[PDB]
Scaffold this active site. Structure first.
Site, PDB file in Angstrom:
ATOM      1  N   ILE B 160     -43.650  -7.554 -31.297  1.00  0.00           N
ATOM      2  CA  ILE B 160     -43.285  -7.190 -32.533  1.00  0.00           C
ATOM      3  C   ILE B 160     -42.281  -8.135 -33.043  1.00  0.00           C
ATOM      4  CG2 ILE B 160     -42.733  -4.997 -34.100  1.00  0.00           C
ATOM      5  CD1 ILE B 160     -44.705  -4.582 -31.915  1.00  0.00           C
ATOM      6  N   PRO B 161     -42.523  -8.631 -34.256  1.00  0.00           N
ATOM      7  CA  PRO B 161     -41.570  -9.514 -35.037  1.00  0.00           C
ATOM      8  C   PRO B 161     -40.217  -8.626 -35.822  1.00  0.00           C
ATOM      9  CG  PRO B 161     -43.201  -9.024 -36.518  1.00  0.00           C
ATOM     10  CD  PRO B 161     -43.763  -8.172 -35.179  1.00  0.00           C
ATOM     11  N   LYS B 186     -42.665  -4.894 -26.836  1.00  0.00           N
ATOM     12  CA  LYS B 186     -41.375  -5.896 -26.913  1.00  0.00           C
ATOM     13  C   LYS B 186     -41.065  -6.024 -28.390  1.00  0.00           C
ATOM     14  CE  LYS B 186     -39.163 -10.119 -26.883  1.00  0.00           C
ATOM     15  NZ  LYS B 186     -39.019  -9.663 -27.972  1.00  0.00           N
ATOM     16  N   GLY B 219     -37.806 -13.244 -26.531  1.00  0.00           N
ATOM     17  CA  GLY B 219     -39.220 -14.071 -26.383  1.00  0.00           C
ATOM     18  C   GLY B 219     -39.501 -14.722 -25.455  1.00  0.00           C
ATOM     19  N   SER B 240     -44.986 -16.234 -35.437  1.00  0.00           N
ATOM     20  CA  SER B 240     -45.337 -17.455 -35.825  1.00  0.00           C
ATOM     21  C   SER B 240     -46.582 -18.137 -35.294  1.00  0.00           C
ATOM     22  CB  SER B 240     -44.265 -18.493 -35.554  1.00  0.00           C
ATOM     23  OG  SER B 240     -44.099 -18.758 -34.214  1.00  0.00           O
ATOM     24  N   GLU B 262     -51.585 -11.838 -35.311  1.00  0.00           N
ATOM     25  CA  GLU B 262     -51.571 -11.912 -36.607  1.00  0.00           C
ATOM     26  C   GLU B 262     -50.019 -12.827 -37.115  1.00  0.00           C
ATOM     27  OE1 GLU B 262     -52.548  -9.771 -38.988  1.00  0.00           O
ATOM     28  OE2 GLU B 262     -53.991  -8.476 -37.760  1.00  0.00           O
ATOM     29  N   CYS B 296     -45.567 -12.777 -43.863  1.00  0.00           N
ATOM     30  CA  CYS B 296     -46.342 -13.792 -43.361  1.00  0.00           C
ATOM     31  C   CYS B 296     -47.537 -13.972 -44.470  1.00  0.00           C
ATOM     32  CB  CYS B 296     -47.025 -12.992 -42.011  1.00  0.00           C
ATOM     33  SG  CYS B 296     -46.026 -12.638 -40.437  1.00  0.00           S
ATOM     34  N   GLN B 343     -33.578 -19.074 -38.691  1.00  0.00           N
ATOM     35  CA  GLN B 343     -34.266 -18.976 -39.872  1.00  0.00           C
ATOM     36  C   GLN B 343     -33.752 -19.431 -41.152  1.00  0.00           C
ATOM     37  OE1 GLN B 343     -37.246 -17.901 -38.030  1.00  0.00           O
ATOM     38  NE2 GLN B 343     -37.699 -17.915 -40.313  1.00  0.00           N
ATOM     39  N   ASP B 345     -31.513 -21.871 -41.197  1.00  0.00           N
ATOM     40  CA  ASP B 345     -31.280 -23.422 -41.385  1.00  0.00           C
ATOM     41  C   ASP B 345     -32.817 -23.946 -41.757  1.00  0.00           C
ATOM     42  OD1 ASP B 345     -28.653 -23.202 -40.316  1.00  0.00           O
ATOM     43  OD2 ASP B 345     -29.437 -23.374 -38.171  1.00  0.00           O
ATOM     44  N   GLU B 393     -44.600 -23.214 -43.864  1.00  0.00           N
ATOM     45  CA  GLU B 393     -44.074 -21.734 -44.097  1.00  0.00           C
ATOM     46  C   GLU B 393     -42.681 -21.787 -44.179  1.00  0.00           C
ATOM     47  OE1 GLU B 393     -45.024 -18.781 -41.024  1.00  0.00           O
ATOM     48  OE2 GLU B 393     -45.598 -17.614 -42.649  1.00  0.00           O
TER      49      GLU B 393
HETATM   50  C1  LIG Z   1     -45.057  -1.681 -46.294  1.00  0.00           C
HETATM   51  C2  LIG Z   1     -46.490  -2.122 -46.401  1.00  0.00           C
HETATM   52  S1  LIG Z   1     -46.984  -3.567 -45.691  1.00  0.00           S
HETATM   53  C3  LIG Z   1     -46.605  -4.887 -46.525  1.00  0.00           C
HETATM   54  N1  LIG Z   1     -45.961  -4.635 -47.784  1.00  0.00           N
HETATM   55  C4  LIG Z   1     -45.732  -5.623 -48.725  1.00  0.00           C
HETATM   56  C5  LIG Z   1     -45.563  -7.091 -48.014  1.00  0.00           C
HETATM   57  C6  LIG Z   1     -45.191  -7.939 -49.481  1.00  0.00           C
HETATM   58  N2  LIG Z   1     -44.993  -7.070 -50.493  1.00  0.00           N
HETATM   59  N3  LIG Z   1     -45.419  -5.750 -50.011  1.00  0.00           N
HETATM   60  C7  LIG Z   1     -45.228  -4.784 -50.892  1.00  0.00           C
HETATM   61  C8  LIG Z   1     -45.853  -7.306 -46.853  1.00  0.00           C
HETATM   62  O1  LIG Z   1     -46.053  -8.488 -46.369  1.00  0.00           O
HETATM   63  N4  LIG Z   1     -46.390  -6.197 -45.881  1.00  0.00           N
HETATM   64  C9  LIG Z   1     -46.728  -6.601 -44.858  1.00  0.00           C
HETATM   65  C10 LIG Z   1     -47.961  -7.194 -44.353  1.00  0.00           C
HETATM   66  C11 LIG Z   1     -48.594  -7.657 -43.468  1.00  0.00           C
HETATM   67  C12 LIG Z   1     -47.684  -7.235 -42.244  1.00  0.00           C
HETATM   68  C13 LIG Z   1     -48.194  -7.849 -40.871  1.00  0.00           C
HETATM   69  C14 LIG Z   1     -48.618  -9.196 -40.739  1.00  0.00           C
HETATM   70  O2  LIG Z   1     -48.441  -9.906 -41.866  1.00  0.00           O
HETATM   71  C15 LIG Z   1     -46.538  -6.611 -42.211  1.00  0.00           C
HETATM   72  C16 LIG Z   1     -46.090  -6.070 -43.500  1.00  0.00           C
HETATM   73  C17 LIG Z   1     -47.581  -0.908 -45.847  1.00  0.00           C
HETATM   74  C18 LIG Z   1     -48.065  -0.237 -46.867  1.00  0.00           C
HETATM   75  C19 LIG Z   1     -49.007   0.782 -46.522  1.00  0.00           C
HETATM   76  C20 LIG Z   1     -49.072   1.329 -45.191  1.00  0.00           C
HETATM   77  C21 LIG Z   1     -48.523   0.343 -44.301  1.00  0.00           C
HETATM   78  C22 LIG Z   1     -47.543  -0.593 -44.540  1.00  0.00           C
END
Ligand SMILES: C[C@@H](Sc1nc2c(cnn2C)c(=O)n1-c1ccc(CCO)cc1)c1ccccc1
Ligand SMILES: C[C@@H](Sc1nc2c(cnn2C)c(=O)n1-c1ccc(CCO)cc1)c1ccccc1
Ligand SMILES: [Cl-]
Ligand SMILES: [Cl-]
Ligand SMILES: [Cl-]
Ligand SMILES: [Cl-]
Ligand SMILES: [Yb+3]
Ligand SMILES: [Yb+3]
Ligand SMILES: [Yb+3]
Ligand SMILES: [Yb+3]
Lengths: 494, 494, 494, 494
Positions: B160-161, B186, B219, B240, B262, B296, B343, B345, B393
Site C-alpha cells: 500500500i502506498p 504492508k 519497502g 511507482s 497500479e 497517480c 519526494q 527533493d 511524474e
Molecule cells: C477518495 C476517492 S479516490 C481518489 N479521489 C481523487 C483523486 C484526485 N482527486 N480526487 C477527488 C485520486 O487520485 N483518487 C485516487 C485515485 C486512484 C487511487 C489508486 C491508484 O491510482 C487512489 C486514489 C474515492 C472515491 C470513491 C470511492 C473510493 C475512493
C-alpha cells in the site's frame, strides 16, 4: 474414417511471414527442421532473430493503429475471417495432419482425428465470440454517465510449443484475433512448418496485413526478443515452467507487458476403492501416455487406494504392453517418437533415477529402435513422493503408480507440489467427487475421466503451472484491456 | 458539515498484526513515523522484516486451509463481516480522518469528507459482491457435465502506498476478502498508523484470525520479502512504475505469483476550443493539484487548443494563486505538505529543470515555510514535450500547460508516453468526445470532468501505468482463480 | 453491386413442413397468395389449421424429448447447423430476394442488399451463441453445491408478420434454435413463400426432423391454435398491438405459456435547434418512409424546434417528392406497394382524418396507379397531438411533422402514448443526447440517426410496443428456462 | 437460541400506506383479520379497493418520474436504504415473528429462526445488487456507439400470498427496489399485518414517499384492480395457478403489463434404492409437512423404488406420528393450524377422495381440536397417479407415497403434470443424480435434500408452476427494462 493424402507431401512455406508476405531473415541465416522418427532433415526454414521480431512488431503496431482496417472493421467481420480461416484449415486437413505428423512425431490418426478437429472447432468457437465481447454501463455515484470499453490490448507476442503445434497456434491466435489484437507468433524451433502453412491461409482468408506475423527461430533468440520488446503489449507463452519464469522476469524488466503462461505439471489422479476400476485404469493410462507423454497435463502421479492397488497396477501394466512403436504415418502404429534429443535424454535420465531410487519397474525402462527418439512405454509401481520421477515433469511415456490408504493424506500429497495444472478423481460417490475436486489445487479437475479438453471451457494452471486462462468465456478477458469512460452530465436517472 | 475530534488524538496501535494479535518484531527493532507538516516524530512502530512476513504468510496460509472457518463460512457471511467493518470505520471516522491527516500530511476536510467516505463506500460496495461471485455451467462437447468454480486464489500480498493510506488499504482488502482470500498487508513506511487502527477493527468485527495480517516496515525489506515469497499466491502493489518493475521481476524469479500493479502516470488532458472553458480550467486545476499533486492520476500535461490557450493559462494561474498553505488540521488551510524529503527533493529538482529547460514560470517554483515539506503551487506554461516536466511524474503541486492546433497530432502527443493511467477530454461535441476517448491509450478517460473515482467502476492503467484493474465487477476477477470441473456422464441433454 | 436472377423465378415449396417432409393440410384446403404490386395470384399454398398445428406440436415435442438427437448433440453442433443454414441462404440469396420482393411488395434492391444481408448476418450471429449459453455456480448459504442450467424452454410457437418475412423468420428461429428449442412457425398469410423455401434449406442443412416445423395459414385459425395450445411452452409474436393483447390473453387462459411480443409503435423523433439539419431530415425521412412505412419503428411523429421547423418541413417535403413508384422488381423504382387491401384502406382512411382534422397536406394524400396497393408518399405539417394521424399507427408512407419550443414539454408529448418501441434524438450537445435518451420511454433510442438495427444489440418495446427483447445477449435469455440444482454436501469450501 | 417478546403484542398499523402516510379507505370500509389457531378476531384493517389502488399507482408514478429523488439518487444509496430496512427488521425481529406467528398460524420457532432470518438475509442480498445492475457496450455493425441501460421498469404491482407473508413481501420489494422501481403491494387478505409494520419501517429508513405503497384488502377487488390497471407497468404474483391464469389474462386485456408468476405445484421426489434411506425419509417428510403443508414446493408425490418402499413408508409414518398440535406461540408445539376455512375444507375434501379412491391411510385423515383450522398429519401409501391426491395441490399436511420399479417410467410420471415448481432426487450415484435432475421438468431440483431456498439462487416454476424467476442474479433481470442507445459516430474503433 481415416483418409490419407494420395500424393507425397511437399514443403512449400519456409519463410518469415510479415505484412502478408514472405521474408528472408535479416541476417540471411536458416535453420534445419527434422523428422523425429527418422532423424532426417525435412527442410530448412528462415531463422528469425531480434532484428526480424522488430520488423514483425512494427507491422503489428501499424495494423493496430486507430483508423486501420483491423481496428475499424465490424467485430462480426473479425468473426467471419476467423470462420473462413477454419474452413480453409478444414479444406487442407489432410495436408496439415500429414505435415503435423511428419514434423512433430505425432501419430497421424490422432493428428487427423483429434488435433485437426480441435483446431477447426476452437477457431469456430473463437469466431463466435468476436461480436459478443462487451463492456458495461455502470451506475456510478454522482451525476455521471460511465461506460467501459473492452478494447483489444494491442500487439501480442505469442510463443508456441512443439507438442501440439497447430492446436497451440489456434489457442493463441483465435482469441487474440477475435478480440481485435494483432500478433507476432514464434512457433517452436522443432515445429515451425504447420504454422507457416496456416500463415498462407491467413493471407488467403483476407486478414489485413500485419494482423498475424509469424517469426520462426530459436527460443533464446527470437523468444527472448519477444519477451523483452518495449513495444509488445502482451506475451502469451506455453512451455516449461523454467522458461515461464524467464518470460515473466523479462516482462517485468522491460515494459511491464501483460503475461499469460500455460506451463507444465506433475498432475495427480486419486483413484478411490469404489471407482469403476477399468474406467479409471483406461483414463489414467491415456492420461499419462497420450502423445508419447508429451502433454503438460500428463497424469504423472496416480494414487490408488490400497485395496484395489495391486489390481490397478496389473491392469495398467497389461494395457501399457499393448503398444506398437514406429513411424507415426504407418497405419497400425500406436506410439511415435519423442520430439528431439534434449527431451529424449531427460526422459532416459529420469527413468534411471526411478531404477536407482528403488521404484518397481513393471515394463519398459529403455530406448527402442535404430533411428528416432523412441522410448519404451514405462510403468513404475511402488513410487514414493521424494523420488525424482514423482517430483519432476518427465514429458515422456513413463507412468508412476502410488498407493494410499488415507484420503486426507493423499489430498495433501496430491497438492504437495509447486505445479497445479490438472488432476483426476475417480469414484462413484457424489460427496467424494465434489469435496475432493474442490480441495485439489488444480486448474482442471476431471471426475471419472481425464484429458477432456474443449473450446467452451477455460484451461490453465494453479501455482507454477500457469498465470491466467485460455479459452472459454473467461480466457477471452486476457486479450482485452478495459477502459472506463466517465462523462459529466447535468442529471442522471436510473 | 465538517465535525472534529474534541479530545487530542492518542496513538494506540503500533505493532505487527498477525492472527488477530499484536506482535513485536522478530529482531525487536522499531522505526519512527513523522508528521510531514511539522517534521516531528509522532511515534515508533514495530519494524517488520522478512522473518515477520514469514509469520504473517504462515498465518494467512493456515486461515486459507480447506475446512477452515474462512473457507467454509457462507459467502454472505464474508459480506456481513465486510459491512460490519465499514460500520466500525464509520463509527471511528473522526479518529481515522485525524490520524490520516496528521500522519499523511492530508487536508483534514478532504480526509474526513472524501477519503473516509470513499473508504466506507468502497467497503460496502465490496461486501455486496461476496455472495455474487459465480462460476459457470458450460455446454462442453461430448457427454460431460462441466462447471467452473471461481475460487479465492489464496494468500495475497498487498503493498500500500502513502498518498491515500486508508483508501488504498480498503481497495486492496475489500475485494480480496469479498472473494475469500487471506491477506498480508504492508502499509507504507511513511503511513503505517491508520492501517493498524483498521486492524483493531478487523478484530472487533470478528474476522477469523489470520484472514488479515498487517506487517508495517520498509519497502526494500518487508516489500521485497512479500514479492519474492515462495508461498504467497498473488502480489498487489500500488506505487511507482520503477518499483512495479522490481515486483513483477521478483514474482517471475520466485514462484510465478500472480501480479496486479497500479502505478504512476503522466496523464494528459485535451481541451478543445469549444469546451466549457471555466469547467475545463476548474477540473484540470484540481486534476493536477489534488492532495499536493500526490495522485497517480495527476493531470500533469494539459494540452489546450491555441485560440483559447492564453485565456486558459490566465484563468488557471489565478486559480493556483488562491491557496492557503499550512497545517492540514487547521480550518481554512487549503494546501498541506509533501509526504517526505525524498519526494520533496525530486519535486524541487524537477521544478529546476522546468526553469533551466525554458518553461515559462507563471507562479510558484520554490519551497514554503520554516518547517514541513511544503512546495509553492507551481504553474508552467509554454511547456514542450521533451522537457523533463512533460516526461517525468513529478508527484507534486506543479501544473504543465501546452498548446496545440492539430487534433491528430495532440492525440499522438497525449499517447506518446510509456504511461497510460488516465486522461481528460473537454469538448461540447458528441463525436469528438467519443472518438478521442476511444483513441486515448488510457485506463480511465474523463469527459468534461477529471478525477471522478467510484467503487462501481474498474480502475487501472494501460501500458506501464499498470497490469489489471481494481474495483468494479471487472476488478473482482483478479482475486479469483478459476477451476474447471469436468465430469463424465452417460448422456448429456441441453 | 446489384445482381439479379437470370431465369424467371418458379415457386416450388407450397406445403406444410412437419418432421422435414411436406404435408397436405388435414382438411385438404388451400389458400391463394398474391403479388401486391399487380394484385395477381402467384400460387396457392396449403392452409394449415388447428388440426395441422397439432401435428406440428407433436413433432416439435418428440424432437424435444430427453435423449433425442437435438437434445443430446453438442451445443457447438447446433451452432454449426445454424451457420450451415446461413451459407445456404447466402447461396440462394438471388432466389430468396426475388421471391421476397415479388410476394412481399418489397423493393428488390433493399430485399437483396439489406433484408438478405441482415438475414445471413443474424443467423451467423446466433450460431455463435449456441455453445456460449451458460448457467452459474452459486455460493448458496449452507453446505450445498448449487448450479443452474439454462435449458431450452421447449416447443416455441412463433408467429411472423408480413413486412419483413425472412428477417422476422430468422429473428425467431435463430435464437430459439441456438438455445436448443424446437419451433412451430406460422408465417403471415400474405407472405408464406420465403419461409417455405427456408424450410427446404433446413432439411438440406441436416436439422433433425421436428426441430423446425412451418405451418402456413391465417391468423385467426392457425395463430389462435398456436396461442391457446396446451403443449406449446412459449409463444413469440411480432405484429399489431391489438393482436398482441389477444395472444397474451390466450396464453393466460390456456397453459400460462411464456410470451414475448414485438408490437407496433408511434415512434417520436426530437430534433433540437442545434442539430445537423440535413442529417436529421435524411434519417427522419427514411425513418418514416422505409419499406412504404410498413415498419413497426416508423418515425411517425417528428417534433422539430420552432426556429428550424419551417426549413425542416421544406427540406423534408422536397425529399418526399423524389420517389418513383412502381413494380419493386424494376430497377430505378424507389417505392413499391402496400401489402394488401386491409392495410391500404386503413392508410387512406387515416390520410382522410389528417385532412378533415386540419393538418397541412404538403404533398401526396391519395392513391397511385391502375393496379397494386399504391399510396402516394404523404407529408403533413402542423400536426397536433389529438389528431388521429398523431395517435394511431398508420403503417403507410405518411410523415407527421410537429413543432415545439419547450424541451420538457416535447419529452412529455413524445412519451404521451401507450406505445414505446423506439425514438430518435438529433442534437450536437453531449448532455442533451444523454439526458433526453434516458428520459424517453422507448426501447431503442437513436442519436443523430434512425433505423439502425443489428444482431448484436437487443431490440423490443417499452409499454404496449412489446414484452421482452429479441437478439443481442439479452434476447437469448427469453429462449432459456432456468433450473436450479442444489446438492447436499458434507462441507463446502469457497 | 429462541428468545421471546416480554410484553404482549399490540397491533398498531392497520391503514393503507401511500406516500409514507397512513390513509383511510376511500369508501371508509374495514375488514377483520383473524387468528387461525383460535378463530378469534385480532383487529380490523382498512379495506383497499380499486379507488385506493388508483391513489397508490398515482403515488408510485410520481415517485418514478424522471428527476425525482428515487430516480436520481445513487444506486449505492438505494442499496443503503435496503440494508437499513434490513437492520430495522432485525431490530423488530421479536415483534415481527410474534405478529407473523399469531396472524399467519405459523410456528413461532420457525417464524423467528427461519422466516425472519430469511427476510433479513434476502434484503441484505438485494441491497448488494443495487449498484451492480449494469448494461452493456456493444460492438454493433457500422460506425456507431451502442450501449444499453438496464432501467427500472416503473410502477410494479405486487400481490403477496398468506403462507410466508414477510418472506414474500421481501422477495417482491427487495429486487424491485434494488433495481429502482416503485411498488404497490397488496398483501393477502388473511395476513396484512406484518406488511403494514414493514411499511412503518420503510418510512423510518427514509425511502422517498411513494416508492413503496401498501394497499391491504381482498384479491377479487384490490388484486383485480392491480392486474387490470392501465398505468401499472408490471405485475408480480405469488399464489394459486388458477388465479395466476386470471392475472396473465387481465394483463393481456389491459395494457400488456409485464408478468411474473410464482404459482403452486405437485412436486415429486424420486427415491432410488441406493439412497441414504433416513436422509431421504427426513427431507421428504419435511418437504411435504413444512408449515402445515402450505408451501408451493410441497413434496406431494414421493416415488420410492419397490425394494425400499415398505421400509420408507414405515419410517415415514413413525416420523409423522411424532407431532404436537396446538397454538404456534406455545413452546414445544410442532404443528399449527391451516390458514382459514376455505383452505381447511379443500384439504379435508381431498383427504376424503384419498379414502374413497382407495389409498391406504397410514395415519391421520381427519380434523383436530375444538378451535382452529387444524388437520391431523396424514400419510397415504399405495397412492396411484389418477387419484385426486396425486393430481391436485392439497396445500395441507398430507403426504402421498408411491412405488416404482422402472426409472424411465417414474421420470415420465414425475413429469406427467401441468405443474413444475420443484423436485427431489435421492441417490448416491453421480450419474443418476446428474441425469435425473436434467430430465426433470422442474425449476429447482434438490439432490439428497429438499426445501433448501436461499437468496443467491433463482427460484421459480417450469410450466404452469410459474413464469420467470425471483432472486439470484437471474431474477433481477425481470425488474429491469432494457433500452438500447445507438449513436452515430464518424468512425468506430474496436
Ligand atoms: C477518495 C476517492 S479516490 C481518489 N479521489 C481523487 C483523486 C484526485 N482527486 N480526487 C477527488 C485520486 O487520485 N483518487 C485516487 C485515485 C486512484 C487511487 C489508486 C491508484 O491510482 C487512489 C486514489 C474515492 C472515491 C470513491 C470511492 C473510493 C475512493
Ligand atoms: C486436441 C485437444 S487438446 C488436448 N487433448 C488431449 C491431451 C491429452 N489427451 N488428449 C486427448 C492434451 O494434453 N491436450 C492439450 C491440452 C492442453 C494444451 C495446452 C497446455 O497444456 C494443449 C493440448 C483439443 C480438443 C478440443 C478442442 C481443442 C483441442
Ligand atoms: Cl467492465
Ligand atoms: Cl468460467
Ligand atoms: Cl442463473
Ligand atoms: Cl444488454
Ligand atoms: Yb542414436
Ligand atoms: Yb528544512
Ligand atoms: Yb382498385
Ligand atoms: Yb368448527
Amino acid at each position: 474414417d481415416l483418409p490419407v493424402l494420395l500424393t507425397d507431401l511437399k514443403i512449400q512455406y519456409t519463410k518469415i511471414f510479415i505484412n502478408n508476405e514472405w521474408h528472408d531473415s535479416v541476417s540471411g541465416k536458416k535453420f534445419p527442421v527434422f523428422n523425429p522418427a527418422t532423424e532426417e532433415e525435412l527442410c530448412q526454414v528462415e531463422e528469425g532473430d531480434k532484428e526480424d521480431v522488430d520488423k514483425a512488431v512494427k507491422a503489428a503496431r501499424q495494423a493496430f493503429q486507430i483508423g486501420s482496417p483491423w481496428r475499424t472493421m465490424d467485430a462480426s467481420e473479425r468473426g467471419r475471417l476467423l470462420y473462413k480461416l477454419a474452413d480453409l484449415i478444414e479444406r487442407d486437413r489432410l495436408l496439415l495432419a500429414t505435415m503435423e505428423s511428419m514434423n512433430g512425431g505425432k501419430l497421424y490418426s490422432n493428428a487427423y482425428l483429434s488435433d485437426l478437429a480441435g483446431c477447426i472447432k476452437t477457431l469456430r468457437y473463437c469466431a463466435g465470440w468476436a461480436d459478443k465481447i462487451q463492456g458495461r454501463t455502470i451506475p456510478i455515484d454522482g451525476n455521471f454517465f460511465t461506460y467501459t470499453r473492452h478494447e483489444p490490448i494491442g500487439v501480442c507476442g505469442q510463443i508456441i510449443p512443439w507438442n501440439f503445434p497447430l492446436v497451440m497456434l489456434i489457442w493463441k491466435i483465435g482469441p487474440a484475433l477475435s478480440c481485435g489484437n494483432t500478433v507476432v507468433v514464434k512457433p517452436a524451433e522443432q515445429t515451425p512448418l504447420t504454422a507457416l502453412h496456416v500463415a498462407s491461409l491467413i493471407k488467403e482468408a483476407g486478414f489485413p496485413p500485419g494482423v498475424v506475423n509469424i517469426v520462426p527461430g530459436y527460443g533464446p533468440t527470437a523468444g527472448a526478443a519477444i519477451s523483452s520488446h518495449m513495444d509488445i503489449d502482451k506475451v502469451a507463452f506455453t512451455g516449461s515452467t523454467e522458461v515461464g519464469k524467464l518470460i515473466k522476469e523479462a516482462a517485468g524488466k522491460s515494459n511491464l507487458k501483460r503475461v499469460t503462461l500455460e506451463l507444465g505439471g506433475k498432475s495427480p489422479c486419486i483413484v478411490l476403492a469404489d471407482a469403476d476400476l477399468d474406467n479409471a485404469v483406461e483414463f489414467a493410462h491415456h492420461g499419462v501416455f497420450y502423445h508419447q507423454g508429451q502433454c503438460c497435463i500428463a497424469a504423472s502421479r496416480i494414487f490408488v487406494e490400497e485395496s484395489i492397488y495391486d489390481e490397478f497396477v496389473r491392469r495398467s501394466v497389461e494395457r501399457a504392453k499393448k503398444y506398437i512403436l514406429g513411424n507415426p504415418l504407418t497405419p497400425g502404429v500406436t506410439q511415435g517418437p519423442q520430439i528431439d534429443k534434449e527431451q529424449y535424454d531427460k526422459i532416459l535420465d529420469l527413468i534411471e533415477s526411478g531404477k536407482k531410487e528403488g521404484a518397481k519397474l513393471e515394463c519398459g525402462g529403455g530406448p527402442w529402435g535404430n533411428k528416432g527418439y523412441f522410448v519404451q512405454p514405462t510403468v513404475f509401481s511402488n513410487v514414493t513422493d521424494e523420488m525424482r520421477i514423482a517430483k519432476e515433469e518427465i514429458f515422456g511415456p513413463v507412468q508412476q503408480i502410488m498407493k494410499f490408504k488415507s484420503l486426507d493424506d493423499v489430498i495433501k500429497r496430491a497438492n504437495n507440489t509447486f505445479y497445479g495444472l490438472s488432476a483426476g478423481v475417480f469414484t462413484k460417490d457424489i460427496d467424494k467427487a465434489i469435496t475432493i475436486s474442490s480441495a485439489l489445487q488444480a486448474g482442471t479437475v476431471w471426475v471419472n475421466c481425464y484429458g477432456v479438453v474443449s473450446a467452451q471451457c477455460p484451461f490453465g494452471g494453479f501455482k507454477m503451472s500457469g498465470n491466467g486462462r485460455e479459452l472459454g468465456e473467461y480466457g477471452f478477458h486476457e486479450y482485452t484491456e478495459v477502459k472506463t469512460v466517465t462523462v459529466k452530465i447535468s442529471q442522471k436517472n436510473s
